[PDB]
């Protein structure tokens, strides 16, 4: 069957792991355990196609930035996550995209911009601000909550649909 290699990137604490775990295991992780690098694999049906999602959950701790080149090499599409209550994480997106761009030597790498924690009211990144960033990259912007599940399937499935346009 078709395999899609997805990679989830973004700053510390934005909810990369909680998003992936909500998608794959259908529950919310409330606690914080920093990730080094974990892999998840699950068979799903997307738009009638039975396929395998292979998802790499990466570290947001800058201390592990040296690992980024390797995972940017293998991935077919990237979920670039920030949190809507974390302006610095939004500003950090470009460093993730710029490296993805250099490593892929491409300006059309499949990606989706994700604004996570949309269940929280302490918003400092307005939807339109993120829409503008995504537009400049030529990719969709989607808001999610790993806590409530809002947008979670949408974000990952949209990334699959982006890879399919490549
Ligand atoms: N309210 C709310 N909290 C969230 C959401 N997503 C993650 N969190 C919380 O934010 C914290 C960090 O989440 P986590 O998924 O570990 O972040 P991460 O981006 O994987 N961190 P790291 O880069 O260190 O691996 C956890 O306490 C988690 O419960 C969300 O959508 N809503
Ligand atoms: Ca829980
Ligand atoms: Ca390279
Ligand atoms: Ca692009
Ligand atoms: Mg994590
Ligand atoms: Mg502002």
Q: Give the closest ligand to the alpha carbon of residue 32.
A: 1
CA nearest ligand 1 atom 7, residue = 15
In this structure, the dihedral spanned by the alpha carbons of residues 50, 148, 145 and 85, taken in order and rounded to 10 degrees, is: -170
With beta carbons less than 8 A apart as the criterion, state whether 130 and 113 touch: yes
Sheet hosting strand 37-46, strand order edge to edge: 37-46, 49-58, 2-10, 77-83, 111-116, 141-143
Experimental method: X-ray
Residue 119 CA: distances (Å) to CA of 73, 90, 115, 141, 145? 33, 17, 11, 16, 6
Domains and CATH numbers, the chain: 1-166 (3.40.50.300)
Give the integer Cα–Cα distance in Å for 12 and 3.
28
Q: Is 86 in the pocket of ligand 1 (CB under 6 A)?
A: no
- DSSP letters of 19-46? HHHHHHHSS---S----SEEEEEEEEEE
Task: Tell me which long-range contacts 47-50 makes (C-beta under 8 A, separation of at least 24).
Answer: 47/161, 49/2, 50/1, 50/2
Mutate which of 20, 31, 146 to test ligand 1's pocket (most atoms within 8 Å of Cβ)? 146
> Phi/psi of residue 152, each to 5°?
-65, -55
Burial of 112 (0-12, 13-18, 19+ CB in 10 A): buried
What would the two tokens of residue 12 be? 């510390």
CA neighbor of 10 nearest in space, from 130, 107, 111, 90:
90
Give the integer Cα–Cα distance in Å for 160 and 68.
21
Q: Give the closest ligand to the alpha carbon of residue 116.
A: 1
What would the two tokens of residue 139 be? 């990719």
CA nearest ligand 1 atom 16, residue = 32
Q: Is 163 in the pocket of ligand 1 (CB under 6 A)?
A: no
Specified resolution (Å): 1.3
């Amino acid at each position: 069957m078709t395999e899609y290699k997805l990679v989830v990137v973004g700053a510390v604490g934005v909810g990369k792991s909680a998003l992936t775990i909500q998608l794959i295991q259908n529950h919310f992780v409330d606690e914080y355990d920093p990730t080094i690098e974990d892999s998840y694999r699950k068979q799903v049906v997307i738009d009638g196609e039975t396929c395998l999602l292979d998802i790499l959950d990466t570290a947001g701790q800058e201390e592990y930035s040296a690992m980024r080149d390797q995972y940017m090499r293998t991935g077919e599409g990237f979920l670039c996550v920030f949190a809507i209550n974390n302006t610095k994480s939004f500003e950090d997106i470009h460093q993730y995209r710029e490296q993805i761009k250099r490593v892929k030597d491409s300006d059309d790498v499949p990606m989706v911009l994700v604004g996570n924690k949309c269940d929280l009211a302490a918003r400092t990144v307005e939807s339109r601000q993120a829409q503008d960033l995504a537009r400049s990259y030529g990719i969709p912007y989607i808001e999610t909550s790993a806590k409530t599940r809002q947008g979670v399937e949408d974000a990952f499935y949209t990334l699959v649909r982006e890879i399919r346009q490549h």
